[PDB]
């Protein structure tokens, strides 16, 4: 689970910044 929670958290931080950028 850790691992599950700590991917989500970066790829929704990633998306989040990509959105940002654009
Ligand atoms: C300090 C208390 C720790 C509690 C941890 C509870 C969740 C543990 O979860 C475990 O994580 C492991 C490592 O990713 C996996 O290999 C196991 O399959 C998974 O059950």
Do not use: C, E, M, Y
């Not at 958290?9 to 950028?21: E, F, Q, Y």
Request: avoid cysteine; proline fraction near 5%.
């Amino acid at each position: 689970p850790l691992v599950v929670a700590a991917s989500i958290i970066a790829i929704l931080h990633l998306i989040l910044w990509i959105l940002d950028r654009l």
